[PDB]
Amino acid sequence: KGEWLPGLASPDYLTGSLAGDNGFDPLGLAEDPENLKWFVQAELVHGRWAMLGVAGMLLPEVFTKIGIINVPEWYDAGKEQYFASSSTLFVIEFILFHYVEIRRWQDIKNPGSVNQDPIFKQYSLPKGEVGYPGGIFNPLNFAPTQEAKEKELANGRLAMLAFLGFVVQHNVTGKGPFENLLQHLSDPWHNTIVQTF
Amino acid sequence: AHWMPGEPRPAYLDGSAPGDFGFDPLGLGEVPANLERYKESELIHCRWAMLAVPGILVPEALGYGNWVKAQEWAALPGGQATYLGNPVPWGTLPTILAIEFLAIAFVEHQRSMEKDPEKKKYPGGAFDPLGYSKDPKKLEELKVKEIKNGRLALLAFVGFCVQQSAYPGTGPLENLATHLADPWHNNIGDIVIP
Amino acid sequence: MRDLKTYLSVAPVISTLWFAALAGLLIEINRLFPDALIFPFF
Amino acid sequence: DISGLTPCKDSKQFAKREKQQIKKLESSLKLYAPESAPALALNAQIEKTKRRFDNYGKYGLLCGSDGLPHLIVNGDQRHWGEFITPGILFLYIAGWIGWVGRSYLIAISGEKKPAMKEIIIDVPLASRIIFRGFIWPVAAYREFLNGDLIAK
């Protein structure tokens, strides 16, 4: 499709068939097809998580700033007390995630093998591509066109960048992200990274 | 009926044997003689654990302490055992140990003299007075049920031992009571992370 | 110019330039950070 | 604290050694004129000694009975940066080097006379290969899983 750097030739193994292909592989990780498939699934799930994470750590801060709800920052959520101890919640999450991730890994290893419901035999998932299960995971039954996949991949990449920026810019300056943006908007020329620390 | 859907079955395990689900990640059953010996050992372990688990559950349900304290009398010199709250007149370490050794050794050596591999797993005859094994139709179902219950009993014994190790001087029943005291506080969390 | 580059690509010359650059980097790091017995960043 | 050791910010032999070194330097400082260059050099040395002692005290080391710091390679969480944190770093860098070298060798195995490329390095291909080692753990793990790490 497009080029990530004009005047540079794209690698041969990247043929533009995959969604969101711009021929960006300077270090040549995806030379073997098996590595390409594994990294494709990684870039999907890694990033599908990141979009939710970024929205969750950003939107409550804005809502709190404008004043509807009073919620602790994304850092101080762990220090807060909940109805149950953190250990029990961690154990529940560990067991459930073990189950679901082993199901997904089995699907990736042997496509079209774990579609059948173990408990209720009649229900099943319609056949499709790996990484896009569809079916019950798509209640509204949207169209899985290539454009939607490209939009999802671009949003996921932006989410990666947003999360890395959030974490590092909190590490350098203890202030929150939205407050950092507001401080920069107060006076751009005196509040950038270079001017302060 | 595989243990993990989407995973190929091993060659030597096709599903003919009762309670076979094609589970062998380490490939220990390649040698047929080793497979038969493993079947024997598994059946014996299952039977012993099945006989043992009620022997832990019924005590500590009455006023008697638990499966650990009932073992502490042998540590004290000159101690005497008790049964149902009554001290056994013949309770002392040397006689008890000698009787156990003689009886168990004779029984086990009698067991080991059988030659037919099938007759070792399922002797039949005089061992079953009721005679549930005459009809071959229900034999496979009964064998599968026995294997599954024995595996469950083995897991129960593992849980008992691990719970005892985590909390010294604690029985399974009081552990269940403590867990039911507050389900959201007394779980595996406090021992898995300090 | 081709043979000049070829000679400058020979093993001893490339090795001495590489080692000189590495020694300069180590020297400058040791001057900027005087002495250190442990890693205190984390 | 550990193995009968004393924290380095509480021991007295540390301060005694610092005083001895400072006095030794100041004895030589007196000889020259206060405004002369050797005086400036000796003042810089004294400042460096004081800063080093303060940093060693603040970093949480453990002096021994005789007064010197002791390193703990045991694995305690209070000494992560004593052995374990640097060591991993080393491995990373070390792995880099090895990986790069291996790659270059393969890159010259195709030609008919690789000896000429071994004794006279080429800069373009080497520069292409050099930066591929920044992600060496991932490529090495993928090659190990695939099975191309070991000859057959």
Ligand code: CLA
């Ligand atoms: C080019 C990379 C390279 C690599 C990957 C290896 C790999 C290995 N070496 Mg070999 N080795 C090398 C070069 C290399 N060696 C050189 C140049 C020499 C002569 C000094 C040796 C002499 C040697 C001995 C005597 C032994 C090994 C052994 C080993 C094995 C164990 C690791 C270790 O002990 O390191 C030992 C490492 C060294 C003593 C020094 C290596 C440092 C060199 C200088 C770095 C490579 C730089 C090179 C010039 C880069 C050029 C590439 C560039 C043009 C792009 C391991 C398979 C050990 C063994 O047999 O294990 C089974 C062992 O007994 N090696």
Ligand SMILES: CC(/C=C/C=C(C)/C=C/[C@@]12O[C@]1(C)C[C@@H](O)CC2(C)C)=C\C=C\C=C(C)\C=C\C=C(C)\C=C\[C@@]12O[C@]1(C)C[C@@H](O)CC2(C)C
């Ligand atoms: C998944 C992810 C983040 C997930 C975050 C989550 C779930 C956060 C959750 C929470 O916030 C909530 C909701 C609420 C809080 O109370 C709690 C926490 C827990 C904090 C980030 C990934 C972040 C991933 C990143 C940044 C990856 C970057 C990769 C890059 C740049 C790779 C580049 C290259 O690989 C290419 C593409 C090609 C090669 O040829 C060249 C090189 C250069 C090697």
